[PDB]
Amino acid sequence: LPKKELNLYVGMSSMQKKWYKKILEKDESKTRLLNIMMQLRKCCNHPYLFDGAEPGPPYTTDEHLVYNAAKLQVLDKLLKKLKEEGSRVLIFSQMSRLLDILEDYCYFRNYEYCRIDGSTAHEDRIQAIDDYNAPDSKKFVFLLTTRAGGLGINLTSADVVVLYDS
DNA sequence: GGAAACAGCTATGACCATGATTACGCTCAGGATGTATATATCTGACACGTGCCTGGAGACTAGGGAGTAATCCCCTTGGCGGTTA
């Protein structure tokens, strides 16, 4: 059985277009751009990563996060579809900090999962893998990094794997 | 009927409360003192004219400092992963 591949070209969120211009035109201000590569990469990845895109002193946790994000709207659609389809999904990303927001947004949707990140533990890696690969595991999603997570482990219990970033 | 025993009354001392007195401080008094003020008058120093002259300001040439292009490559940068003190 082969594998399918689709590249979900989604438009960059209009809400963060303010800050994306604020990065291109150097408009928010008075910070580093020593690696314009990464700065645009983080804005390409997620807006709240720039330390002030989340204005709330209580830091509200609601649909605004998926609202202000370009990708998570398609993610929310695909998570709803794959939940009914029973697809056991794996998510890969580069920024461990971004995964915190996904961990927070996983809490919002109340999914079971296990978060493996660079330098979590030794026994925690084993146990989180076991719970995810446990038979009939309801851990519908699985947070994982890119350069720390997928270098030899087998996840045949899963079928669909999604990249947040390239 | 007498003696003991207890109870109540009385007085006195003790202790606390109030009144006065005093002393000390201070804040007014008042004196002492030293300071500001004004004024009228010297006077020396600062400002200004005069003369002069030599640096300043052009005027002119020439030759390499500075300026730019192109090139490159090494290095700083940043995020992570995983340790541990």
Report the principal-axis shape: globular
- What characterizes the major β-sheet? 3 strands, parallel
Distance between the termini: 25 Å
Number of strands: 3
Family: Belongs to the SNF2/RAD54 helicase family. ISWI subfamily.
Subunit structure: Component of the ISW1A complex, which at least consists of ISW1 and IOC3. Component of the ISW1B complex, which at least consists of ISW1, IOC2 and IOC4.
Protein name: ISWI chromatin-remodeling complex ATPase ISW1
Subcellular location: Nucleus
SSE topology:
Blueprint (H helix, E strand, L loop, with lengths): L16 H8 L11 H10 L17 H6 L2 H15 L3 E5 L2 H14 L13 H10 L10 E3 L14 E4 L3
Helix pairs in contact: 1-2
The structure holds one DNA strand of 85 nucleotides.
PDB class: protein binding
Keywords: Ioc3 binding, protein binding
Entry title: Cryo-EM structure of ISW1a-dinucleosome
Please supply descriptive tags for the structure shown above.
1 chains, protein binding, three-stranded parallel beta sheet, 166 residues, ISWI chromatin-remodeling complex ATPase ISW1, mainly alpha, Ioc3 binding, EC 3.6.4.-, DNA-binding
Structural write-up:
- Belongs to the SNF2/RAD54 helicase family. ISWI subfamily.
- This is part of a larger assembly, with one chain.
- This protein is mainly α and 166 residues long.
- The longest helix has 15 residues, at 71-85.
- The protein is built from six helices and three strands; from the N terminus they run ααααβααββ.
- Helix 1 packs antiparallel against helix 2.
- Helices cover 38% and strands 7% of the residues.
- It starts with 16 loop residues before the first helix and ends with a strand.
- It binds one DNA strand of 85 nucleotides through loops.
